[PDB]
Tab-separated table of N, CA, C and O in Angstrom:
chain	number	residue	atom	x	y	z
A	60	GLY	N	0.796	-1.078	0.003
A	60	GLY	CA	0.093	-0.017	0.003
A	60	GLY	C	0.788	1.173	-0.055
A	60	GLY	O	0.596	2.151	-0.837
A	61	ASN	N	1.926	1.251	0.861
A	61	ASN	CA	2.843	2.408	0.798
A	61	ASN	C	3.460	2.659	-0.449
A	61	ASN	O	3.615	3.718	-0.927
A	62	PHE	N	3.748	1.434	-1.170
A	62	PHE	CA	4.526	1.362	-2.391
A	62	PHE	C	3.528	2.219	-3.377
A	62	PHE	O	4.127	3.087	-4.196
A	63	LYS	N	2.226	1.949	-3.330
A	63	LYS	CA	1.225	2.437	-4.336
A	63	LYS	C	1.109	3.922	-4.120
A	63	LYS	O	1.169	4.588	-5.065
A	64	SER	N	1.139	4.266	-2.738
A	64	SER	CA	0.767	5.662	-2.512
A	64	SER	C	2.224	6.549	-3.027
A	64	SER	O	1.645	7.463	-3.680
A	65	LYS	N	3.209	6.058	-2.846
A	65	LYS	CA	4.321	6.863	-3.306
A	65	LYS	C	4.554	6.859	-4.774
A	65	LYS	O	4.851	7.803	-5.425
A	66	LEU	N	4.074	5.738	-5.413
A	66	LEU	CA	3.950	5.529	-7.006
A	66	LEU	C	3.044	6.641	-7.309
A	66	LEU	O	3.175	7.386	-8.392
A	67	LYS	N	1.658	6.733	-6.797
A	67	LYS	CA	0.800	7.664	-7.290
A	67	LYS	C	1.318	9.161	-7.233
A	67	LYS	O	1.207	9.929	-7.905
A	68	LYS	N	1.926	9.323	-5.998
A	68	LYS	CA	2.635	10.694	-5.834
A	68	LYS	C	3.495	11.238	-6.905
A	68	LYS	O	3.736	12.304	-7.705
A	69	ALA	N	4.624	10.180	-7.350
A	69	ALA	CA	5.356	10.243	-8.300
A	69	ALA	C	4.645	10.727	-9.607
A	69	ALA	O	5.120	11.523	-10.384
A	70	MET	N	3.726	9.744	-9.964
A	70	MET	CA	2.783	10.010	-11.061
A	70	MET	C	2.300	11.502	-11.463
A	70	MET	O	2.193	12.055	-12.210
A	71	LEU	N	1.813	11.884	-10.199
A	71	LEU	CA	1.046	13.003	-9.902
A	71	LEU	C	2.199	14.222	-10.438
A	71	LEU	O	1.813	15.080	-11.112
A	72	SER	N	3.350	14.240	-9.819
A	72	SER	CA	4.197	15.234	-10.102
A	72	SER	C	4.711	15.216	-11.564
A	72	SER	O	4.636	16.280	-12.087
A	73	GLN	N	4.953	14.033	-12.001
A	73	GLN	CA	5.271	13.911	-13.431
A	73	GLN	C	4.268	14.662	-14.356
A	73	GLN	O	4.370	15.369	-15.206
A	74	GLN	N	3.113	14.294	-14.027
A	74	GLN	CA	1.986	14.599	-14.825
A	74	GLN	C	1.779	16.313	-14.630
A	74	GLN	O	1.863	17.020	-15.847
A	75	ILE	N	1.978	16.750	-13.686
A	75	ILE	CA	1.726	18.451	-13.326
A	75	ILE	C	2.978	18.904	-14.340
A	75	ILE	O	2.808	19.952	-14.860
A	76	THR	N	4.293	18.452	-14.040
A	76	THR	CA	5.404	19.156	-14.703
A	76	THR	C	5.152	19.161	-16.267
A	76	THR	O	5.231	20.008	-17.149
A	77	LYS	N	4.704	17.870	-16.713
A	77	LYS	CA	4.597	17.720	-18.114
A	77	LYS	C	3.522	18.779	-18.781
A	77	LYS	O	3.780	19.396	-19.756
A	78	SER	N	2.314	18.891	-18.028
A	78	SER	CA	1.259	19.882	-18.317
A	78	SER	C	1.853	21.122	-18.481
A	78	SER	O	1.517	21.920	-19.268
A	79	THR	N	2.523	21.673	-17.324
A	79	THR	CA	3.146	22.789	-17.507
A	79	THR	C	4.148	23.327	-18.651
A	79	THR	O	3.674	24.352	-19.223
A	80	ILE	N	4.801	22.414	-18.936
A	80	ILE	CA	5.604	22.719	-20.022
A	80	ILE	C	4.735	22.737	-21.207
A	80	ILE	O	5.027	23.702	-22.003
A	81	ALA	N	3.958	21.761	-21.363
A	81	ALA	CA	3.170	21.821	-22.631
A	81	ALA	C	2.510	22.942	-22.699
A	81	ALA	O	2.324	23.797	-23.990
A	82	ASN	N	1.807	23.696	-21.660
A	82	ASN	CA	0.797	24.846	-21.786
A	82	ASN	C	1.742	26.072	-22.029
A	82	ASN	O	1.527	26.858	-23.006
A	83	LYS	N	2.794	26.301	-21.178
A	83	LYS	CA	3.643	27.175	-21.545
A	83	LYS	C	4.235	27.398	-22.994
A	83	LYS	O	4.561	28.652	-23.602
A	84	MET	N	4.545	26.373	-23.707
A	84	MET	CA	4.761	26.444	-25.009
A	84	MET	C	3.725	27.175	-25.796
A	84	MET	O	4.291	27.977	-26.558
A	85	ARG	N	2.713	27.120	-25.651
A	85	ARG	CA	1.502	27.820	-26.247
A	85	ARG	C	1.662	29.399	-26.186
A	85	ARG	O	1.483	30.040	-26.927
A	86	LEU	N	1.858	29.500	-24.870
A	86	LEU	CA	2.091	31.084	-24.358
A	86	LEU	C	3.261	31.554	-25.245
A	86	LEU	O	3.205	32.520	-25.802
A	87	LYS	N	4.540	30.811	-25.290
A	87	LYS	CA	5.399	31.311	-26.346
A	87	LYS	C	4.973	31.538	-27.643
A	87	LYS	O	5.405	32.776	-28.439
A	88	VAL	N	4.305	30.619	-28.233
A	88	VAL	CA	3.922	30.682	-29.624
A	88	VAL	C	3.188	31.952	-29.802
A	88	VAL	O	3.199	32.635	-30.844
A	89	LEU	N	2.141	32.168	-29.032
A	89	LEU	CA	1.259	33.261	-29.107
A	89	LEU	C	2.000	34.671	-28.965
A	89	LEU	O	1.544	35.527	-29.693
A	90	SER	N	3.065	34.602	-28.140
A	90	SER	CA	3.752	35.780	-27.962
A	90	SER	C	4.305	36.080	-29.093
A	90	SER	O	4.563	37.320	-29.516
A	91	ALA	N	4.866	35.152	-29.683
A	91	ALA	CA	5.656	35.323	-31.062
A	91	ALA	C	4.801	35.776	-32.120
A	91	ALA	O	5.357	36.847	-32.689
A	92	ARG	N	3.732	35.355	-32.285
A	92	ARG	CA	2.740	35.955	-33.292
A	92	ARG	C	2.410	37.339	-32.801
A	92	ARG	O	2.352	38.273	-33.758
A	93	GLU	N	1.950	37.678	-31.669
A	93	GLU	CA	1.735	39.017	-31.352
A	93	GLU	C	2.887	39.836	-31.595
A	93	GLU	O	2.778	41.238	-31.837
A	94	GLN	N	4.015	39.466	-31.310
A	94	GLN	CA	5.428	40.364	-31.605
A	94	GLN	C	5.454	40.810	-33.088
A	94	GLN	O	5.650	41.762	-33.547
A	95	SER	N	5.237	39.688	-33.915
A	95	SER	CA	5.121	39.928	-35.259
A	95	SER	C	4.166	41.006	-35.700
A	95	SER	O	4.397	41.714	-36.543
A	96	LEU	N	2.853	40.833	-35.245
A	96	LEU	CA	1.909	41.741	-35.429
A	96	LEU	C	2.337	43.188	-35.184
A	96	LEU	O	1.832	44.116	-35.848
A	97	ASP	N	2.910	43.209	-34.009
A	97	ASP	CA	3.383	44.663	-33.410
A	97	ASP	C	4.323	45.143	-34.481
A	97	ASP	O	4.465	46.482	-34.450
A	98	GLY	N	5.217	44.300	-34.635
A	98	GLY	CA	6.137	44.719	-35.642
A	98	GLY	C	5.638	45.575	-37.055
A	98	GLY	O	6.071	46.489	-37.517
A	99	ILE	N	4.580	44.806	-37.630
A	99	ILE	CA	3.848	45.136	-38.661
A	99	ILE	C	3.267	46.635	-38.426
A	99	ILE	O	3.203	47.572	-39.154
A	100	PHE	N	2.521	46.677	-37.171
A	100	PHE	CA	1.922	48.004	-36.973
A	100	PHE	C	2.788	48.893	-36.817
A	100	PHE	O	2.713	50.164	-37.241
A	101	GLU	N	4.102	48.738	-36.252
A	101	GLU	CA	5.257	49.618	-36.238
A	101	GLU	C	5.719	50.143	-37.508
A	101	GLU	O	6.191	51.278	-37.666
A	102	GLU	N	5.918	49.459	-38.525
A	102	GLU	CA	6.163	49.654	-39.710
A	102	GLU	C	5.264	50.427	-40.325
A	102	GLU	O	5.451	51.546	-40.976
A	103	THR	N	3.925	50.094	-40.140
A	103	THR	CA	2.865	51.213	-40.683
A	103	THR	C	2.805	52.417	-39.949
A	103	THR	O	2.848	53.634	-40.725
A	104	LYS	N	3.063	52.404	-38.660
A	104	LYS	CA	3.189	53.785	-37.845
A	104	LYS	C	4.451	54.708	-38.637
A	104	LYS	O	4.237	55.802	-38.748
A	105	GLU	N	5.426	53.951	-38.863
A	105	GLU	CA	6.758	54.676	-39.481
A	105	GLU	C	6.305	55.418	-40.629
A	105	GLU	O	6.840	56.314	-40.934
A	106	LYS	N	5.726	54.619	-41.536
A	106	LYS	CA	5.358	55.031	-42.813
A	106	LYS	C	4.218	56.134	-42.835
A	106	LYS	O	4.507	57.249	-43.548
A	107	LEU	N	3.298	56.191	-41.684
A	107	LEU	CA	2.436	57.156	-41.649
A	107	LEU	C	3.213	58.488	-41.337
A	107	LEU	O	2.953	59.698	-41.695
A	108	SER	N	4.086	58.414	-40.145
A	108	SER	CA	4.845	59.533	-39.796
A	108	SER	C	5.806	59.993	-40.858
A	108	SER	O	5.871	61.231	-40.971
A	109	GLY	N	6.414	59.202	-41.537
A	109	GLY	CA	7.235	59.814	-42.855
A	109	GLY	C	6.255	60.351	-43.823
A	109	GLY	O	6.701	61.702	-44.163
A	110	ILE	N	5.266	60.055	-44.171
A	110	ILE	CA	4.354	60.631	-45.190
A	110	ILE	C	3.741	62.056	-44.488
A	110	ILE	O	3.331	62.893	-45.254
A	111	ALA	N	3.733	62.045	-43.164
A	111	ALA	CA	3.337	63.315	-42.567
A	111	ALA	C	4.133	64.397	-42.856
A	111	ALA	O	3.850	65.602	-42.660
A	112	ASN	N	5.410	64.222	-43.310
A	112	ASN	CA	6.354	65.302	-43.757
A	112	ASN	C	6.029	66.009	-44.707
A	112	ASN	O	6.328	67.243	-44.805
A	113	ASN	N	5.165	65.450	-45.749
A	113	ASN	CA	4.888	66.279	-46.964
A	113	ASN	C	4.147	67.311	-46.602
A	113	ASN	O	3.245	67.380	-45.502
A	114	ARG	N	4.499	68.409	-47.225
A	114	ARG	CA	3.785	69.945	-46.901
A	114	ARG	C	2.747	70.143	-48.036
A	114	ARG	O	2.413	71.487	-48.132
A	115	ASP	N	2.395	69.440	-48.999
A	115	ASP	CA	1.477	69.531	-49.996
A	115	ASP	C	0.480	68.483	-50.043
A	115	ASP	O	-0.981	69.048	-49.991
A	116	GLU	N	0.615	67.430	-50.291
A	116	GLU	CA	-0.465	66.280	-49.926
A	116	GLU	C	-0.886	66.355	-48.557
A	116	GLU	O	-2.239	65.635	-48.583
A	117	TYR	N	-0.416	66.893	-47.614
A	117	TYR	CA	-1.035	66.949	-46.346
A	117	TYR	C	-2.174	67.819	-46.291
A	117	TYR	O	-2.891	67.597	-45.312
B	10	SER	N	12.533	-53.967	46.878
B	10	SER	CA	12.345	-53.199	47.956
B	10	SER	C	11.870	-51.530	47.987
B	10	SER	O	11.488	-51.185	46.925
B	11	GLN	N	12.275	-50.720	49.034
B	11	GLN	CA	12.173	-49.482	48.746
B	11	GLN	C	12.859	-48.951	47.538
B	11	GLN	O	12.496	-47.967	46.877
B	12	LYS	N	14.107	-49.328	47.242
B	12	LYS	CA	14.866	-48.999	46.073
B	12	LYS	C	14.091	-48.956	44.853
B	12	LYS	O	13.991	-47.959	44.088
B	13	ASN	N	13.539	-50.113	44.453
B	13	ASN	CA	12.849	-50.286	43.264
B	13	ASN	C	11.691	-49.707	42.970
B	13	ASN	O	11.002	-49.672	41.936
B	14	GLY	N	11.070	-49.356	44.310
B	14	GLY	CA	9.833	-48.583	44.272
B	14	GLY	C	10.056	-47.243	44.450
B	14	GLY	O	8.896	-46.502	44.287
B	15	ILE	N	10.879	-46.681	44.702
B	15	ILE	CA	11.242	-45.280	44.911
B	15	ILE	C	12.401	-44.649	43.931
B	15	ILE	O	12.138	-43.638	43.212
B	16	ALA	N	13.541	-45.233	44.046
B	16	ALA	CA	14.513	-44.416	43.240
B	16	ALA	C	14.281	-44.684	41.652
B	16	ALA	O	14.573	-43.557	40.899
B	17	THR	N	14.118	-45.873	41.153
B	17	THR	CA	13.591	-46.042	39.921
B	17	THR	C	12.369	-45.306	39.511
B	17	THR	O	12.395	-44.822	38.307
B	18	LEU	N	11.595	-45.249	40.187
B	18	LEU	CA	10.375	-44.425	40.006
B	18	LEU	C	10.549	-42.925	39.916
B	18	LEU	O	9.957	-42.373	38.959
B	19	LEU	N	11.465	-42.475	40.771
B	19	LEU	CA	11.930	-40.890	40.667
B	19	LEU	C	12.439	-40.733	39.395
B	19	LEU	O	12.403	-39.771	38.754
B	20	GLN	N	13.461	-41.806	38.988
B	20	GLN	CA	14.258	-41.613	37.620
B	20	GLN	C	13.165	-41.501	36.640
B	20	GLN	O	13.249	-40.883	35.569
B	21	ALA	N	12.256	-42.562	36.658
B	21	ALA	CA	11.063	-42.450	35.272
B	21	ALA	C	10.425	-41.107	35.495
B	21	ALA	O	10.096	-40.616	34.357
B	22	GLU	N	10.046	-40.484	36.674
B	22	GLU	CA	9.635	-39.254	36.638
B	22	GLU	C	10.443	-38.117	36.057
B	22	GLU	O	10.083	-37.332	35.396
B	23	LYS	N	11.853	-38.411	36.056
B	23	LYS	CA	12.783	-37.558	35.682
B	23	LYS	C	12.770	-37.823	34.115
B	23	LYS	O	12.928	-36.685	33.344
B	24	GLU	N	12.662	-38.845	33.778
B	24	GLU	CA	12.648	-39.162	32.044
B	24	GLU	C	11.322	-38.220	31.741
B	24	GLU	O	11.339	-37.681	30.735
B	25	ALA	N	10.256	-38.331	32.347
B	25	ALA	CA	8.948	-37.666	31.835
B	25	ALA	C	9.194	-36.133	31.953
B	25	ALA	O	8.706	-35.572	30.989
B	26	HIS	N	9.871	-35.642	32.985
B	26	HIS	CA	10.188	-34.251	33.011
B	26	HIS	C	10.972	-33.833	31.942
B	26	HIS	O	10.894	-32.825	31.440
B	27	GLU	N	12.076	-34.800	31.525
B	27	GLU	CA	12.861	-34.374	30.556
B	27	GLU	C	12.055	-34.412	29.039
B	27	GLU	O	12.280	-33.383	28.316
B	28	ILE	N	11.137	-35.262	28.954
B	28	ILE	CA	10.399	-35.335	27.674
B	28	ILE	C	9.486	-34.069	27.700
B	28	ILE	O	9.306	-33.252	26.678
B	29	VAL	N	8.737	-33.636	28.672
B	29	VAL	CA	7.920	-32.308	28.613
B	29	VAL	C	8.852	-31.131	28.480
B	29	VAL	O	8.589	-30.325	27.858
B	30	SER	N	10.061	-31.237	29.054
B	30	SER	CA	11.038	-29.983	29.038
B	30	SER	C	11.403	-29.940	27.418
B	30	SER	O	11.349	-28.829	26.968
B	31	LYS	N	11.549	-31.088	26.772
B	31	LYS	CA	12.201	-31.047	25.480
B	31	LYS	C	10.826	-30.323	24.706
B	31	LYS	O	11.103	-29.719	23.672
B	32	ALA	N	9.496	-30.865	24.896
B	32	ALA	CA	8.527	-30.434	24.250
B	32	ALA	C	8.339	-28.719	24.509
B	32	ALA	O	8.202	-28.097	23.465
B	33	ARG	N	8.663	-28.223	25.813
B	33	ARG	CA	8.639	-27.053	25.802
B	33	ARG	C	9.567	-26.317	24.965
B	33	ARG	O	9.333	-25.182	24.350
B	34	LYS	N	10.867	-26.781	24.946
B	34	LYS	CA	11.786	-26.367	24.209
B	34	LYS	C	11.488	-26.348	22.577
B	34	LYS	O	11.877	-25.335	21.913
B	35	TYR	N	11.001	-27.350	22.202
B	35	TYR	CA	10.374	-27.402	20.778
B	35	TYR	C	9.381	-26.238	20.529
B	35	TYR	O	9.423	-25.440	19.594
B	36	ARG	N	8.650	-25.866	21.460
B	36	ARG	CA	7.371	-24.904	21.414
B	36	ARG	C	8.186	-23.356	21.258
B	36	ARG	O	8.079	-22.620	20.445
B	37	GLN	N	9.116	-23.210	22.337
B	37	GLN	CA	9.872	-21.993	22.373
B	37	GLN	C	10.775	-21.628	21.170
B	37	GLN	O	10.375	-20.564	20.533
B	38	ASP	N	11.245	-22.713	20.552
B	38	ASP	CA	12.186	-22.471	19.425
B	38	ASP	C	11.352	-22.054	18.162
B	38	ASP	O	11.706	-21.397	17.404
B	39	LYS	N	10.198	-22.950	18.176
B	39	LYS	CA	9.234	-22.909	16.969
B	39	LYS	C	8.712	-21.566	16.859
B	39	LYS	O	8.482	-20.807	15.989
B	40	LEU	N	8.306	-20.963	18.161
B	40	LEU	CA	7.775	-19.640	18.355
B	40	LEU	C	8.841	-18.541	17.849
B	40	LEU	O	8.401	-17.621	17.284
B	41	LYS	N	10.116	-18.695	18.416
B	41	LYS	CA	11.028	-17.814	17.980
B	41	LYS	C	11.386	-18.057	16.507
B	41	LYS	O	11.709	-16.939	15.924
B	42	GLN	N	11.194	-19.131	15.785
B	42	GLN	CA	11.252	-19.344	14.420
B	42	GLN	C	10.126	-18.601	13.800
B	42	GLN	O	10.428	-17.628	12.776
B	43	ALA	N	9.083	-18.418	14.082
B	43	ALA	CA	7.833	-17.938	13.865
B	43	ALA	C	7.954	-16.221	13.760
B	43	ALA	O	7.721	-15.750	12.775
B	44	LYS	N	8.740	-15.863	14.724
B	44	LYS	CA	9.124	-14.265	14.796
B	44	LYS	C	10.159	-14.040	13.713
B	44	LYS	O	10.110	-12.990	13.079
B	45	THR	N	11.419	-14.684	13.764
B	45	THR	CA	12.506	-14.495	13.038
B	45	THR	C	12.185	-14.541	11.542
B	45	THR	O	12.675	-13.874	10.675
B	46	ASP	N	11.679	-15.704	11.003
B	46	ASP	CA	11.224	-15.949	9.561
B	46	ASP	C	10.379	-14.700	9.134
B	46	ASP	O	10.552	-14.182	8.053
B	47	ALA	N	9.458	-14.414	9.866
B	47	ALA	CA	8.377	-13.217	9.556
B	47	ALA	C	9.443	-11.993	9.502
B	47	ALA	O	9.083	-11.221	8.663
B	48	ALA	N	10.238	-11.932	10.336
B	48	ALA	CA	11.217	-10.529	10.422
B	48	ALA	C	12.085	-10.448	9.084
B	48	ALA	O	12.154	-9.493	8.527
B	49	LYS	N	12.548	-11.705	8.646
B	49	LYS	CA	13.412	-11.650	7.529
B	49	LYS	C	12.569	-11.551	6.300
B	49	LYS	O	13.031	-10.955	5.428
B	50	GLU	N	11.311	-11.965	6.270
B	50	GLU	CA	10.239	-12.044	5.060
B	50	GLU	C	9.944	-10.533	4.667
B	50	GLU	O	9.895	-10.026	3.507
B	51	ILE	N	9.646	-9.803	5.942
B	51	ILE	CA	9.144	-8.412	5.625
B	51	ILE	C	10.123	-7.500	5.169
B	51	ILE	O	9.817	-6.748	4.310
B	52	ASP	N	11.357	-7.765	5.432
B	52	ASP	CA	12.549	-7.133	4.884
B	52	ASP	C	12.708	-7.429	3.272
B	52	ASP	O	12.993	-6.550	2.606
B	53	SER	N	12.426	-8.733	2.965
B	53	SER	CA	12.612	-8.994	1.615
B	53	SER	C	11.570	-8.383	0.885
B	53	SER	O	11.992	-7.816	-0.410
B	54	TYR	N	10.350	-8.374	1.313
B	54	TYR	CA	9.381	-7.679	0.663
B	54	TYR	C	9.537	-6.112	0.668
B	54	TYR	O	9.381	-5.487	-0.533
B	55	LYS	N	10.024	-5.506	1.687
B	55	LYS	CA	10.261	-4.117	1.641
B	55	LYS	C	11.272	-3.723	0.663
B	55	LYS	O	11.001	-2.799	-0.087
B	56	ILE	N	12.388	-4.427	0.570
B	56	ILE	CA	13.371	-4.095	-0.340
B	56	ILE	C	13.064	-4.443	-1.916
B	56	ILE	O	13.341	-3.525	-2.642
B	57	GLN	N	12.134	-5.413	-1.935
B	57	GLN	CA	11.606	-5.509	-3.441
B	57	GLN	C	10.840	-4.550	-3.954
B	57	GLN	O	10.772	-4.084	-4.962
B	58	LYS	N	9.976	-3.905	-2.794
B	58	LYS	CA	9.013	-2.826	-3.396
B	58	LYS	C	10.034	-1.551	-3.729
B	58	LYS	O	9.508	-0.639	-4.361
B	59	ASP	N	11.026	-1.260	-2.709
B	59	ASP	CA	11.516	-0.115	-2.518
B	59	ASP	C	12.464	-0.035	-3.922
B	59	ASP	O	12.643	1.088	-4.382
B	60	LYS	N	13.101	-0.956	-4.360
B	60	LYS	CA	13.819	-1.101	-5.525
B	60	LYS	C	13.118	-0.605	-6.711
B	60	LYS	O	13.658	0.518	-7.272
B	61	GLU	N	12.136	-1.294	-7.001
B	61	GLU	CA	11.253	-1.101	-7.924
B	61	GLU	C	10.774	0.423	-8.049
B	61	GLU	O	10.704	1.154	-9.008
């Protein structure tokens, strides 16, 4: 019985660790995607600021 | 006479007392075996579970 209890504890620990890693992978991926989107937005903002310099088409 | 009715009879009593004493020794050693064998087997089971 004690052997079974210890084995169950070990399995629980392993399960939680594996789930943690698998989950945080998703956070990393989504963060990368949002970083790419932010880069695109910055590009657009820079182009808008540049075109703001014109004194006739403005 | 008194001798064959007393001394030999007491010696037969001593024989019977020896037999019952040996029976007691069998009982005692068997009980101690019952304890020691169990003590050794529990450790065998414990190490078997612990290793795995």
